[PDB]
Amino acid sequence: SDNVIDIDLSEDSPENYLLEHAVDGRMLFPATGTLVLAWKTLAKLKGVEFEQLGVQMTNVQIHQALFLNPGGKTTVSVSVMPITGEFQVRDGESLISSGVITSSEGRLLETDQHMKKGSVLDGKPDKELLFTKEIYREFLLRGYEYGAAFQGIQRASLDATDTDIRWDGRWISYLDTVLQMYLLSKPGTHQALPTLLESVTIDPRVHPAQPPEGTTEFQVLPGKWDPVLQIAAAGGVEIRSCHSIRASRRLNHDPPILEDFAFAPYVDPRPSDRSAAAVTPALRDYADACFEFSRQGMKRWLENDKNNVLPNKEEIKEALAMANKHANFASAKATLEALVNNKNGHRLPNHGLFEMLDIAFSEPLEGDYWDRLRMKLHDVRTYLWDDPIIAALESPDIVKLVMETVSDNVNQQVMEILEVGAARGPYYRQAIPKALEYFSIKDWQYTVADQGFVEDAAEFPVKMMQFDPLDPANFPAELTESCDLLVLKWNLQMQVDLDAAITEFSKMIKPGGFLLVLENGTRLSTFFPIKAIVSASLGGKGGPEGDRAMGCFYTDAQWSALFARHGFEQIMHIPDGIAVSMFLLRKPFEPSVAPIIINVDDLECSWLEEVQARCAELQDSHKDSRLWLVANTELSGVLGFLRSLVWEFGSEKLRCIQIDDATAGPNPPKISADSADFKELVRKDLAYNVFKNGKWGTYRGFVISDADRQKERPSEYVYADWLSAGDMSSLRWFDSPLKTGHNNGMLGSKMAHKLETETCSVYYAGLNLRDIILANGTIQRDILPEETFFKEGVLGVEFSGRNSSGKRVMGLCPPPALATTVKCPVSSLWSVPDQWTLEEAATVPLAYATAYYCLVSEGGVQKGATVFIHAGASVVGQASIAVALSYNCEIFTLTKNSDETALLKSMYPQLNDRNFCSSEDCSFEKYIRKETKGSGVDVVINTLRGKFLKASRRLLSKKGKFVDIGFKVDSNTQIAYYTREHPDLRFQLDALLESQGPEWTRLFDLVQAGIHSGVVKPLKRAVYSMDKIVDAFKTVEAEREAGKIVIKIRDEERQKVCPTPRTSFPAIHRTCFHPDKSHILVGGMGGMGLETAHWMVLRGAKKLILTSRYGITTGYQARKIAFFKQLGVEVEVLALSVNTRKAADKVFEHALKMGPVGGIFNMAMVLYNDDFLKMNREQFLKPLESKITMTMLLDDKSREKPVRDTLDHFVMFSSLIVSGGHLGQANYAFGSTVLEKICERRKRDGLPVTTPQWASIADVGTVALTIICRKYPQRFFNVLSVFDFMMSSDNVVTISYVLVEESMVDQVLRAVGKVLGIKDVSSVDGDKEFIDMGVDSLMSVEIKQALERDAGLVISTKDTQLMTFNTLRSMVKG
């Protein structure tokens, strides 16, 4: 109605700086933005200039978020009431801000900060001051992405009190920099969006005028944060009592890929090896049964045949001989159908071969046989391609080992892949999505070819071609020396003359190129029936290796001999054992000049000069020349040294060999010049040869599936939490730190109350409406008592189980009581009478504890009084009635339907139909006001809101008490709580349980008395198993029926005093650190170390020893070290480099004096970057002190007592240079690999070990100061999410890196899908509602404003979470 403001976010608009203010990629309109809009509107209403007006806003609620549209225009409709001052910023029919704005001509500023002249932060050292770089590192880690216009604070103190805010003319930015003093006054790790500024004064007549136009050296106005009054003041601005709401963090990039750098043998892999085929017992049994099906079926073909219709009839008869050589129909299917319908968990992903064998066999013998079934089997060809037998040599592990080992050894910049015969056996469907979509250093070229057009290869990044694959001598001459890798999936068998086929195909391979073949080698009669129908002809020429089986196919042993006979070198060979078999072949390499061997065994780098000289001649040598780096010991970082060296010299003449002495078999290799084992290696000419576990292989990074990050394993102590906040379908069971004895959240306030606690084993956990409210996002955990801020979880309070002595007990404890073990204060634990089962006792404590608090403690009920109870059927409602009846009260209750009324009457016979009303409408007021004869009700237990709350107040007697225990309070009544206008009684039982003072003991005595006197009686119950936690929570939320919901954790024993049997529960990982153990963080005072030490402190660590070469040398370090000490952590900062056994002893001496050493982390780095040839000895060994010299001295200490018995974690941070390499960092690659091998010797001996192998990381360190080797930097809040996975894992090194990535109907769908965090909208189901995937409270508003910004649709927020993708598509068209 009033002034409409147009925010122009264009390329050169003056308000283009408003885009330099984002929260994890969300470009929101500043909360102080609405303050200026309201401020300017009032001035325009008054007619004065907005800079000459002194205003004061009160209770500025940011009702909803405004998402600024980049490169566009947003409109708001500020409206100010003339005399009252009620201002309102809105956009259409949606509210965006509210409050009251008032102008005045007198002093509006409370604090006397507009008078300060200079800056208190003068003359202070650099280690007692924060600067612009360090202040906004703190904000960035919390999700606040400030740009250059919003980076006002130039300096500050370690206390955050004094600042040097900059004044540059813009008011929306200045008021935000004053609101940043509030945010950096509350150190933490979560992301909070301000939503209520209780008072703001912007008196501009005491504020310096706008800078003279053209200024660049803007002045700085001293500011200060008043922790007493909660006032942030700077110049002529003050913001007082600003509150915020926690928000979940959004990942701007895509999820990381985690791999497992592990050794993988090349030839004849044993079952225990990683390159071995994936043959579980279930698959082998399926092949046996299915092979029997082929045997039994093929018998029927030669029995029913009477018209001579069987294609290639003679072949089937010949094949049956093989089946009998390597040995009813109804039983054959019976066995398979038993396997096809079982759900024991040992099932195969799908049974495709049988579906193809069944359709062919079951098909009838009659006319058009050959053509009819040749057109039907071809339609189910997907079954043969996607089958467990065939998917055993196409699994991700084997496919990657193939493509990467080829990529490493191809000495060009583009990997050319040519597959011939792609219509029958396609290898692009496996090669591309499993191995070639993870490439980041080599670009690939895939060419599919066959007789016709490849239909299924249409969606893949391939190029098509046409020639005859089944006939040689006709392959186009344009393909000579055209591909580095040749793929022949199920193609060589269809040739008639193999010798003519191989010799011609070998002309395809470039010099040093590779060839790949997949063929059936064992049990050759199993797949024939499909082949017989599909193959037009089955006539082929045998060879010296033997006559071709059937007309096509050749036994594995024959293939190997044939390829060997034709002068091929077997680089790899993976025999599946059930059917197919893979060969990866390459021609021999005969050097014309003797190879050069340089032993790189030494770790002191006595070989550096030799390598430097002999690698400087690589650019002027014969192509056949080579340089081999040989290491005959386990500890040698030559696999990262080469991979970084090959970046500066090419892969034509750089090779390495590493013999692992520890794992070398009884016959170790004898690689020495004119040796025997060496000559074999030279012929293969592979860039990476490692002898480990008695086989030649290569170190490869195998991708860890994303499903394993949430895999559940047995755990003794577990507790329920949520994976994503605000989603009730994401509740899982995580590991509980109570395995360490103590509990998380022992920081800050929780250390002031030294309550004596009894460790209890939870048998039943009660579910209240408090837990559902927190779980489904209706309330953030910050509303709870401050003592629960750092707790592991906030779900569950009541329980019933057995104490440490075996007695049966029940009570209330600070959360999480929804666990299997709790530490309940001894003053909150009642004893179960010897008439209630542990199931019944789980319903009493909270329901009756709140009933007594509402009536006897807060309402002061008296005998004969009249009480009004809302929601009589609820658990607290039922408890309230029982207490009141014991007090001989007159009861009026609100019952939803007649079932609830009947239920209550049955439970309490004293209730007639006169004591019941209806909650459907506020018609009870007349009834209660007539039956009480106008006196009203003495006590009102209120849960309903809105008009029912008003009517309930009006029923109060003159001395009546109103107890409001509802959870979904309004906005005005939420302000009342903040400003101390009303008391917040909806989380008082929680607050009492933290303190457990005189107020609580009154309730403990009352409930305890109630048990004895018979008032306290168990309520109705509904037990839910542990795994049905999600269903239990939904049942409580719906409130479709009355009764308690209790989760059964264990089974109550028959005895009454007996020990709890030790059992395990399935739960997700959660790393925890012992509070009584000291943790060493070597080099932990920098970048990732300080933000990792923060993570450990939140997860249990309370004893840290941070080590550095100098000490605390920056203001950011001194601030966080002071922050930890404030939280109750004992931090000792040592300025000692551990580069000598003496120093290592000193560091651990200061450790054992704090507590048993229960962790050693090395996050040290000293980088020197330069080309390998220009680096002297001293310059080379610079990054080799924190990664080699240290890690061996820290390793040695952990191997010797008393640390060995006590040590629990041993983490050695590494980088991707070990697996990807880099240029100039030959030294850092060498050291980083030796750190990766010292962490595998620990695994051989069984000691704990972990070695994260990171990639570019953001927000903290080296990169912090983007895209290197095409890999995007990770967000640290993800670095710590995967790091938690890394610690609770069995592997040594876990690679973690991030790789960089129409109609109007599809336009908005992609945008809407992007909000939810979906990369392919089409992939997910079109019938699955948004709430099912997950839509918290900010994704819905973004979609709501996007469906209007992008299209004309205007939807409701609630409608967003219950609408499918199909609904959205069908709605935009309308």
Ligand X SMILES: *P(=O)(O)OCC(C)(C)[C@@H](O)C(=O)NCCC(=O)NCCSC(C)=O
Q: Is 1338 in the site for ligand X (CB under 6 A)?
A: yes
From the list ligand NDP, ligand X, none, pick the one residue 278 interacts with, judged by a Cβ distance below 5 to 8 Å according to partner type: none
Nearest in space to 350 (alpha carbons), one of 376, 383, 378: 383
Amino acid at 1039: E
From the list ligand X, ligand NDP, none, pick the one residue 23 interacts with, judged by a Cβ distance below 5 to 8 Å according to partner type: ligand X
Interacting stretch for ligand NDP, rule CB under 6 A, among 167-175, 234-242, 255-263, 1259-1267?
1259-1267
CB nearer to ligand NDP: give 16 or 440: 440
Name beta bridge partners: 826. none
Interacting stretch for ligand X, rule CB under 6 A, among 59-67, 253-261, 488-496, 569-577?
59-67
Nearest in space to 781 (alpha carbons), one of 772, 793, 769: 793
Q: Is 64 in the site for ligand X (CB under 6 A)?
A: yes
Which helix (H) or strand (E) is 1370 found in, with range? Answer: helix 1365-1373
Q: Is 1331 in the site for ligand X (CB under 6 A)?
A: no
Nearest in space to 1238 (alpha carbons), one of 1184, 1175, 1202, 1281: 1184
Q: Which of 5, 120, 193, 1351 binds ligand X (CB under 6 A)?
A: 193
Angle between helices 329-341 and 353-362 (to 10 degrees): 150
Interacting stretch for ligand NDP, rule CB under 6 A, among 140-148, 339-347, 1096-1104, 1160-1168?
1160-1168
Q: Which of 1110, 1200, 1266, 1320 binds ligand NDP (CB under 6 A)?
A: 1110
Which residues, numbered 1183-1222, are part of the site for ligand NDP (CB under 6 A)? 1185-1186, 1213, 1215
Q: Is 135 in the site for ligand X (CB under 6 A)?
A: no
Sign of CA dihedral 1024, 1026, 1028, 1030: positive
Q: Is 111 in the site for ligand X (CB under 6 A)?
A: no
CB nearer to ligand NDP: give 879 or 1163: 1163
d(CA 759, CA 749): 21
Q: Which of 32, 788, 952, 1107 binds ligand NDP (CB under 6 A)?
A: 1107
Name beta bridge partners: 654. 627
From the list ligand NDP, ligand X, none, pick the one residue 804 interacts with, judged by a Cβ distance below 5 to 8 Å according to partner type: none
From the list ligand X, ligand NDP, none, pick the one residue 1192 interacts with, judged by a Cβ distance below 5 to 8 Å according to partner type: none
CB nearer to ligand X: give 310 or 1338: 1338
Q: Nearest approach, Cβ of 142 to ligand NDP (angstroms)?
A: 18
Query: How many residues in the shown chain lie near ligand NDP by CB under 6 A?
Result: 28
Amino acid at 189: T
Per 3-state DSSP, the chain is made up of helix, strand and coil in percentages (nearest 5) of 35, 20, 40
CB nearer to ligand X: give 28 or 373: 28
Angle between helices 369-377 and 353-362 (to 10 degrees): 160
Does 255 sit behind a cis peptide bond, omega within 30 degrees of 0 on the bond before it?
Answer: no
Q: Which of 9, 18, 30, 1233 binds ligand X (CB under 6 A)?
A: 30
Q: Nearest approach, Cβ of 971 to ligand X (angstroms)?
A: 10
3-state SS assignment for residue 515: strand
Interacting stretch for ligand NDP, rule CB under 6 A, among 242-250, 700-708, 821-829, 1078-1086?
1078-1086
Interacting stretch for ligand NDP, rule CB under 6 A, among 476-484, 720-728, 852-860, 1104-1112?
1104-1112
Name beta bridge partners: 485. 417, 514
Tokens 């790189």 belong to which residue?
Answer: 600
Sign of CA dihedral 669, 675, 680, 681: positive
Q: Is 62 in the site for ligand X (CB under 6 A)?
A: yes
d(CA 1074, CA 1071): 10
Q: Which of 101, 1257, 1292, 1299 binds ligand NDP (CB under 6 A)?
A: 1257
Q: How many CB atoms lie within 10 A of CB 929?
A: 16
Binding mask 1121-1140 for ligand NDP (x = CB under 6 A): ----------------x---
d(CA 808, CA 833): 9
Q: Is 1083 in the site for ligand NDP (CB under 6 A)?
A: yes
Q: Which of 130, 795, 1165, 1295 binds ligand NDP (CB under 6 A)?
A: 1165
From the list ligand NDP, ligand X, none, pick the one residue 1083 interacts with, judged by a Cβ distance below 5 to 8 Å according to partner type: ligand NDP
Q: Which of 7, 9, 18, 28 binds ligand X (CB under 6 A)?
A: 28
Q: Is 1262 in the site for ligand NDP (CB under 6 A)?
A: yes
Q: Nearest approach, Cβ of 1139 to ligand NDP (angstroms)?
A: 6
From the list ligand X, ligand NDP, none, pick the one residue 1088 interacts with, judged by a Cβ distance below 5 to 8 Å according to partner type: ligand NDP
From the list ligand X, ligand NDP, none, pick the one residue 245 interacts with, judged by a Cβ distance below 5 to 8 Å according to partner type: ligand X
d(CA 1033, CA 1028): 9
The answer for residues whose C-beta is within 8 angstroms of residue 666's C-beta and 6 or more apart is none
d(CA 880, CA 806): 32
Which helix (H) or strand (E) is 450 found in, with range? Answer: strand 443-450
Q: Is 201 in the site for ligand NDP (CB under 6 A)?
A: no
Q: Is 98 in the site for ligand X (CB under 6 A)?
A: no
The answer for residues whose C-beta is within 8 angstroms of residue 1145's C-beta and 6 or more apart is none
Q: Nearest approach, Cβ of 111 to ligand X (angstroms)?
A: 23
Q: Measuring CA to CA, how many Å separate 190 from each of 133, 781, 814, 1017, 1124? A: 20, 11, 22, 43, 16
Nearest in space to 329 (alpha carbons), one of 350, 304, 349, 346: 304
From the list ligand X, ligand NDP, none, pick the one residue 1213 interacts with, judged by a Cβ distance below 5 to 8 Å according to partner type: ligand NDP
Angle between helices 171-183 and 33-46 (to 10 degrees): 140
Q: Nearest approach, Cβ of 646 to ligand NDP (angstroms)?
A: 20
Q: Are strands 713-715 and 829-831 parallel, antiparallel or unpaired?
A: unpaired
The answer for residues whose C-beta is within 8 angstroms of residue 281's C-beta and 6 or more apart is 346
Are 680 and 671 a contacting pair, CB within 8 Å?
no
Tokens 């098909």 belong to which residue?
Answer: 363
Query: How many residues in the shown chain lie near ligand X by CB under 6 A?
Result: 16
Q: Is 640 in the site for ligand NDP (CB under 6 A)?
A: no
Q: Nearest approach, Cβ of 1340 to ligand X (angstroms)?
A: 8
d(CA 643, CA 633): 19
Are 1214 and 1235 a contacting pair, CB within 8 Å?
yes
Q: Which of 1087, 1100, 1224, 1231 binds ligand NDP (CB under 6 A)?
A: 1087
Nearest in space to 267 (alpha carbons), one of 571, 498, 642, 597: 571
Q: Is 1261 in the site for ligand NDP (CB under 6 A)?
A: yes
3-state SS assignment for residue 314: helix
| Residue of minimal Cβ distance to ligand X | 1337
Interacting stretch for ligand X, rule CB under 6 A, among 60-68, 87-95, 484-492, 1141-1149?
60-68
d(CA 224, CA 120): 10
From the list ligand X, ligand NDP, none, pick the one residue 1337 interacts with, judged by a Cβ distance below 5 to 8 Å according to partner type: ligand X
The residues of the shown chain that bind ligand NDP, judged by CB under 6 A, are 1082-1083, 1085-1089, 1107-1110, 1113, 1137, 1163-1166, 1185-1186, 1213, 1215, 1254, 1256-1257, 1260-1263
The residues of the shown chain that bind ligand X, judged by CB under 6 A, are 23, 28, 30-31, 62, 64-65, 144, 193-195, 245, 247, 1337-1338, 1341
